[PDB]
Amino acid sequence: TTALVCDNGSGLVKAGFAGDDAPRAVFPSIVGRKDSYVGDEAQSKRGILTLKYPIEHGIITNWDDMEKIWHHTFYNELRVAPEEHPTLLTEAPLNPKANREKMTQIMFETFNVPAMYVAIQAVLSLYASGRTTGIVLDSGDGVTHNVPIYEGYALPHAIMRLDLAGRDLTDYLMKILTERGYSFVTTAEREIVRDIKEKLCYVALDFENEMATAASSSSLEKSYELPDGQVITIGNERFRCPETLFQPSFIGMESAGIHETTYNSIMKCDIDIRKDLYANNVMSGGTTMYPGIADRMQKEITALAPSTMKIKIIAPPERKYSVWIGGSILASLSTFQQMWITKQEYDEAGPSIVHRKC
Ligand X SMILES: Nc1ncnc2c1ncn2[C@@H]1O[C@H](COP(=O)(O)OP(=O)(O)OP(=O)(O)O)[C@@H](O)[C@H]1O
Ligand Y SMILES: C/C1=C/C(=O)O[C@@H]2C[C@@H](CC[C@H](C)/C=C/C=C/CC1)O[C@@](O)([C@@H]1CSC(=O)N1)C2
Binding site for ligand X (CB under 6 A): 9-12, 58, 140-143, 165-167, 194, 197-198, 285-287, 289-290, 320
Residues within window 22-51 making contact with ligand Y, judged by CB under 6 A: 28, 30, 40, 43, 51
Work out how close the CB of 140 gets to Ca ion at its nearest, in angstroms, rounded to a whole number: 4
Instruction: Output 45 or 357, the one with its CB closest to ligand Y.
Output: 45
Instruction: Output 240 or 320, the one with its CB closest to Ca ion.
Output: 320
Residues within window 44-83 making contact with another protein, judged by CB under 8 A: 56, 61
104 binds ligand Y (CB under 6 A): no
DSSP 110: I
Maximum pairwise Cα distance, the chain: 70
Q: Could you write out the DSSP letters of every residue in 157-200?
A: GG-EEES--HHHHHHHHHHHHHHHT----SHHHHHHHHHHHHHH
Q: Which one of 41, 91, 138, 141 is in contact with ligand Y (CB under 6 A)?
A: 141
Residues within window 94-153 making contact with Ca ion, judged by CB under 5 A: 140
Taking residues 8 to 47 in sequence order and writing x for each that binds Ca ion by CB under 5 A, - otherwise, the string is: -x--------------------------------------
Q: Are 118 and 91 in contact (CB under 8 A)?
A: yes
Alpha-carbon distances, residue 240 vs 174, 197, 206, 218 (angstroms): 12, 11, 11, 16
Instruction: Output 9 or 32, the one with its CB closest to Ca ion.
Output: 9
Task: Give the one entry of ligand Y, ligand X, another protein, none that residue 190 binds, where binding means its C-beta sits below a cut-off of 5 to 8 angstroms depending on kind.
Answer: ligand Y
Strands 25-28 and 31-32: unpaired
320 binds ligand Y (CB under 6 A): no
Nearest to 301, CA basis, from 318, 291, 314: 314
Distance from chain centroid for Cα 330? 18
Task: Give the one entry of ligand Y, Ca ion, another protein, none that residue 9 binds, where binding means its C-beta sits below a cut-off of 5 to 8 angstroms depending on kind.
Answer: Ca ion
Count of residues touching Ca ion (by CB under 5 A): 2
Task: Give the one entry of ligand X, ligand Y, another protein, none that residue 252 binds, where binding means its C-beta sits below a cut-off of 5 to 8 angstroms depending on kind.
Answer: another protein
Helix ranges, the chain (H): 41-44, 63-71, 97-105, 121-128, 166-180, 187-200, 207-215, 237-246, 258-267, 274-278, 293-304, 322-332, 343-348, 353-357
DSSP 256: P
170 binds ligand Y (CB under 6 A): yes
Q: Are 162 and 138 in contact (CB under 8 A)?
A: no
Compute the distance between CA of residue 249 and CA of residue 253 in angstroms, rounded to an integer: 5
Q: Are 183 and 211 in contact (CB under 8 A)?
A: no
Task: Give the one entry of ligand Y, another protein, Ca ion, none that residue 255 binds, where binding means its C-beta sits below a cut-off of 5 to 8 angstroms depending on kind.
Answer: another protein
12 binds ligand Y (CB under 6 A): yes
317 binds another protein (CB under 8 A): no
Compute the distance between CA of residue 71 and CA of residue 314 in angstroms, rounded to an integer: 35
Helix (H, G, I), strand (E, B) or coil at 52: strand
Nearest to 282, CA basis, from 154, 179, 182: 154
Residues within window 221-280 making contact with another protein, judged by CB under 8 A: 248-249, 252, 254-256, 260-261, 264, 267-268
Amino acid letter, residue 88: L
Task: Give the one entry of another protein, ligand Y, Ca ion, none that residue 185 binds, where binding means its C-beta sits below a cut-off of 5 to 8 angstroms depending on kind.
Answer: none
In the complex, the residues that contact ligand Y under the rule CB under 6 A are 11-12, 28, 30, 40, 43, 51, 141, 166-167, 170, 187, 190-191, 194
In the complex, the residues that contact Ca ion under the rule CB under 5 A are 9, 140
In the complex, the residues that contact another protein under the rule CB under 8 A are 56, 61, 94, 96-98, 160-162, 248-249, 252, 254-256, 260-261, 264, 267-268
